[PDB]
Design a protein around this ligand. Structure first.
Ligand SMILES: O=C(CO)[C@@H](O)[C@@H](O)CO
Ligand SMILES: O=C(CO)[C@@H](O)[C@@H](O)CO
Ligand SMILES: O=C(CO)[C@@H](O)[C@@H](O)CO
Ligand SMILES: O=C(CO)[C@@H](O)[C@@H](O)CO
Ligand SMILES: OC[C@@]1(O)OC[C@H](O)[C@@H]1O
Ligand SMILES: OC[C@@]1(O)OC[C@H](O)[C@@H]1O
Ligand SMILES: OC[C@@]1(O)OC[C@H](O)[C@@H]1O
Ligand SMILES: OC[C@@]1(O)OC[C@H](O)[C@@H]1O
Ligand SMILES: OC[C@@]1(O)OC[C@H](O)[C@@H]1O
Ligand SMILES: OC[C@@]1(O)OC[C@H](O)[C@@H]1O
Ligand SMILES: OC[C@@]1(O)OC[C@H](O)[C@@H]1O
Ligand SMILES: OC[C@@]1(O)OC[C@H](O)[C@@H]1O
Ligand SMILES: OC[C@@]1(O)OC[C@H](O)[C@@H]1O
Ligand SMILES: OC[C@@]1(O)OC[C@H](O)[C@@H]1O
Ligand SMILES: OC[C@@]1(O)OC[C@H](O)[C@@H]1O
Ligand SMILES: OC[C@@]1(O)OC[C@H](O)[C@@H]1O
Ligand SMILES: OC[C@@]1(O)OC[C@H](O)[C@@H]1O
Ligand SMILES: OC[C@@]1(O)OC[C@H](O)[C@@H]1O
Ligand SMILES: OC[C@@]1(O)OC[C@H](O)[C@@H]1O
Ligand SMILES: OC[C@@]1(O)OC[C@H](O)[C@@H]1O
Ligand SMILES: OC[C@@]1(O)OC[C@H](O)[C@@H]1O
Ligand SMILES: OC[C@@]1(O)OC[C@H](O)[C@@H]1O
Ligand SMILES: OC[C@@]1(O)OC[C@H](O)[C@@H]1O
Ligand SMILES: OC[C@@]1(O)OC[C@H](O)[C@@H]1O
Ligand SMILES: OC[C@@]1(O)OC[C@H](O)[C@@H]1O
Ligand SMILES: OC[C@@]1(O)OC[C@H](O)[C@@H]1O
Ligand SMILES: OC[C@@]1(O)OC[C@H](O)[C@@H]1O
Ligand SMILES: OC[C@@]1(O)OC[C@H](O)[C@@H]1O
Ligand SMILES: OC[C@@]1(O)OC[C@H](O)[C@@H]1O
Ligand SMILES: OC[C@@]1(O)OC[C@H](O)[C@@H]1O
Ligand SMILES: OC[C@@]1(O)OC[C@H](O)[C@@H]1O
Ligand SMILES: OC[C@@]1(O)OC[C@H](O)[C@@H]1O
Ligand SMILES: [Co+2]
Ligand SMILES: [Co+2]
Ligand SMILES: [Co+2]
Ligand SMILES: [Co+2]
Lengths: 249, 249, 249, 249
């Protein structure tokens, strides 16, 4: 009886309720943001999250993201920065994760992000060590803080436990905390505690997000190379493809 | 009786009340953000705003800014982007402007910003035309929208009316509106309507802010050139210096 | 295929999401408030609201109510007021109504209520004329305002349209409006507009609520007569019984 | 240099900022609520609170109250309840108390209240023992909980320390806590902790408030006796009169 898609009813209720929660928290959600790309399920085997529902507390990789801003910030740049513009830009989005669910392990080669918890608490799992890029020297300034070891008993999604292996550092973020930075090239993932009485709601402020999603299919590229560029590298293969399309029946 | 400074009492009450308002609106204001640099008065002649107070509705150039994030985002960048890093980075801050007061005319050579109104309404004045930079070619993608002509009867600060001359385009932003982008190299200014029952509260999400302020004096520079760099160019000279220091008695 | 109950999953998701929305809006929802009595479906034939779900926009009589306060306020009263205490007391609750759904036609003999819209907009239907009580004289002071006629095209629940007949006055309430009073002995009902992007969330502040609900079964009565007293009189019979118990499968 | 009044500027800034804070927290504050009666200073000697200001942390008895509802709830009552109506009714208001300031010791003969902390934390001081009323028997049901002893080092207003003597029970309330009931005939007072980074903001939901205030001078009485009735009994005489009028210069 393994689910392989989400019904139109389950999708709309999931996304509409989330938008309402976001609006209650004063996030500027416009109509075009509430679309068939907002609800993300990372892989066919993750649709089983809708067997018992988003309030079961079971570990699955699915989440909602409402993108209010994804600006290239290319205008006004000296032409010499053209090849480096993809590392800049401005992206603002509201992320909603239900109890026990995860934004799965992945890293970005160009995108650096920051987190601001609005509601609930955020458990971030990450590698304090950045990845390298064969043949190219990289700059360094602050690097990532080491953080703490994982707490006991973190239930991971079935069949994807090994994907969290390298994300050894842990940090629990709460509303009102200082902004937390996740530098590019660092593996990261996060979940909403399973016992949370509310969905985790976090605002991400980061550099440009290169994601050829369904709701993105059709946009114009500010610079040639950008077109089709996918700056997401999920440890789990099923996650990389799932990210770009949701199966709604 | 022209004021040339703000008393410790006026400053603390101004800044503390603003922080409380920000907290009520769920902005993550930490203790280090509530400092002697948060309250900005753009020039000695602007201290007269405290003759009748922040609720008089009189046109003066003063505002409060609580910076929660100003990340260089240099880590993980290929060394070749070093000279262009100053155009990137991530800056998040809450800006509070009282009735009739202004964030004065200025432009940034490197910083691109975006606005999200949280409380009240924001009246933005700007030049749809970007400035040029002698000897260097610049990229273009979306440019700035033209906007509308100024509404009738906008009271400008005394002795600084000519500084708003080139900012011919006008746009009134409200809570819930789409994010509004202010590209680098564009002159811009904004105020809270004089008849507003509440201070204007807006969240700015932009690229790195190069501002050698008092509360900034002492930070480490990620890249040599950055040290001491001031990416603010106010049309009014008194505004450029005032920005970097508040006179508290 | 007519539904006659709501599944445990549908109930929990409905109520849990609503509690989260309430919490986001700063309403003090404690654990004991999130129970099997919070989600109300007014009659077996109204369970069909869960055929297409709470976001279908279809007209059904169901709602969520989180009661934070229901205080008798009998302590300190002169004994002579004993027979009149049931008209006083203090009740505070958060009511959540989804698009197109209704809090059905009914009146209270003792309870006077007031409304404060927190999110969305509230459409109130009521009789400006109070009901009488055979054999007893009643006091008068302000009475109810007449209001406006119903707007065109209000979809009512199937088979219950006649129950709204006498509720001729209409008023649409919004967040920030003056408190709206619904005097006891006045027929009233309300819904969330079908095109609302968010569930209607309203805070009711009223006198004591005499409702022998399931989650109420077991409380102590401050005064003999109060025990078992049901101060709700729904025009629709199915509504009176449904109110006191939800069928969860 | 002892202050004996508050300047128009100090008053407006105090009240306007508070209204903005209330609005940010979604309390329905209308224009008529922002008047010359909202800011309360309990006695001529308490105006010294404005010597160093509302952010000094000094112990003074002053506060802001925005009343959104004060409904007699007399309509629909059987005539026999006329003499007991004054114990009922509905009153909703937002109370704002700055760091270290107090809502001074007092009790009500008819009014029962409840508290809901919206921002900050509330320290309530009260007598678990109700007062008696010569010649009249009173009802009892739940009475007041005993609470805890006062914490160490509570700074009381100068020259009014003895007024807090009988208020031996203490309870610290926070946002999200269960509603707290203060039965009529119980002495009570409260303050915002002196080290609070934000003003204390609390919503009071109670029975009718009989207060012949300045902004009240002119209202119609639903029942003869009510006219001019003052249901406030402050332990400090200067507090009883101060409550009804603010000296603005
Ligand atoms: O359109 C939006 C906001 O809905 C984003 O996807 C970006 O295009 C904003 O620049
Ligand atoms: O410290 C803060 C936030 O208070 C900012 O000034 C930046 O340093 C954050 O990166
Ligand atoms: O317990 C509560 C709040 O959850 C109400 O039902 C009343 O009992 C409060 O007095
Ligand atoms: O007018 C108001 C709300 O501003 C109160 O004083 C009461 O009159 C409401 O019934
Ligand atoms: O409007 C979309 C929807 O929620 O409305 C009815 C159906 O259930 C579908 O899922
Ligand atoms: O395409 C719009 C929409 O139907 O898609 C997802 C969301 O539910 C919204 O209602
Ligand atoms: O009141 C909530 C809000 O500010 O947040 C989003 C929605 O657009 C609305 O403007
Ligand atoms: O609204 C946010 C979003 O889901 O919509 C388009 C893009 O895919 C982004 O993830
Ligand atoms: O880490 C957060 C995030 O990058 O992960 C998935 C989605 O792209 C979102 O922006
Ligand atoms: O040291 C290399 C590595 O294994 O460590 C960190 C990064 O995730 C990369 O995979
Ligand atoms: O105990 C935590 C942990 O060791 O278990 C799985 C994950 O890889 C993480 O490193
Ligand atoms: O704490 C700072 C301050 O507000 O406290 C007292 C004095 O007025 C000064 O302005
Ligand atoms: O330096 C800290 C501080 O005194 O400076 C400004 C703000 O009022 C805060 O209290
Ligand atoms: O409740 C308001 C809040 O979320 O906003 C800022 C403060 O830190 C607090 O956490
Ligand atoms: O807290 C924000 C701020 O005022 O503090 C330091 C810097 O000057 C910035 O403008
Ligand atoms: O336009 C907004 C702003 O750039 O103007 C002044 C301050 O630097 C703030 O960040
Ligand atoms: O055309 C050049 C200019 O005058 O127009 C726009 C920019 O402000 C610059 O000053
Ligand atoms: O009327 C608006 C305006 O023309 O007046 C002053 C400012 O320069 C602006 O362009
Ligand atoms: O916890 C209750 C529940 O939501 O969890 C799993 C099952 O679906 C049930 O409805
Ligand atoms: O009885 C508690 C509960 O299961 O009942 C309704 C709500 O969903 C809550 O989880
Ligand atoms: O932050 C939201 C909140 O104030 O509202 C309800 C919950 O208890 C929490 O305290
Ligand atoms: O929590 C609110 C409530 O649903 O719980 C008990 C009572 O029935 C009331 O209606
Ligand atoms: O009119 C609102 C209400 O009285 O109707 C049903 C429930 O009792 C709620 O309190
Ligand atoms: O006049 C009597 C009546 O029909 O009118 C109002 C009330 O609802 C009652 O039913
Ligand atoms: O058109 C509105 C109306 O006449 O139609 C049904 C309901 O009785 C109401 O009075
Ligand atoms: O509008 C009232 C006021 O604030 O405006 C100017 C003067 O200071 C007075 O206090
Ligand atoms: O009378 C109205 C008013 O002036 O009185 C107090 C408040 O400041 C408001 O502005
Ligand atoms: O957005 C804040 C608000 O809801 O609270 C009071 C003001 O009227 C406004 O409607
Ligand atoms: O707005 C609330 C209030 O101050 O205004 C009138 C009455 O005095 C009450 O205390
Ligand atoms: O205890 C709160 C209160 O009764 O004390 C003063 C004012 O009357 C307010 O309503
Ligand atoms: O026992 C009588 C008394 O002293 O105790 C409680 C009440 O305050 C009254 O003053
Ligand atoms: O220590 C607390 C206390 O004993 O001191 C003063 C007040 O009367 C209170 O009872
Ligand atoms: Co990421
Ligand atoms: Co700027
Ligand atoms: Co009712
Ligand atoms: Co009181």
């Amino acid at each position: 009886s393994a689910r392989t898609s989400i019904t139109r009813r389950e999708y709309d209720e999931w996304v509409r309720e989330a938008a309402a929660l976001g609006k209650a928290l004063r996030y500027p959600i416009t109509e075009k943001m509430v679309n068939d790309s907002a609800g993300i399920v990372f892989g066919a085997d993750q649709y089983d999250a809708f067997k018992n529902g988003m309030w079961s507390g079971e570990p699955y990789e699915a989440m909602i993201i409402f993108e209010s801003l994804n600006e290239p910030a290319v205008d006004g740049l000296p032409t010499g920065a053209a090849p480096y513009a993809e590392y800049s830009g401005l992206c603002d989005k509201l992320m909603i994760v239900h109890p026990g669910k995860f934004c799965p392990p992945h890293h970005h080669g160009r995108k650096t992000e920051s987190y601001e918890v609005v509601l609930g608490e955020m458990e971030v799992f990450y590698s304090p060590t950045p990845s390298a890029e064969s043949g190219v020297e990289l700059l360094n300034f602050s690097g990532m803080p080491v953080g703490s070891p994982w707490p006991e008993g973190v239930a991971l999604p079935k069949g994807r436990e090994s994907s969290y292996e390298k994300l050894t550092s842990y940090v629990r973020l709460r509303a009102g905390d200082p902004k937390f930075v996740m530098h590019r090239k660092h593996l990261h993932a996060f979940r909403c505690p399973p016992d949370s009485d509310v969905p985790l709601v976090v605002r991400e402020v980061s550099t440009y997000s290169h994601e050829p999603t369904e709701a993105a299919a059709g946009n114009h590229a500010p610079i040639p190379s950008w077109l089709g560029m996918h700056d997401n590298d999920f440890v789990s293969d099923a996650a990389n493809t799932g990210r770009l399309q949701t199966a709604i029946s």
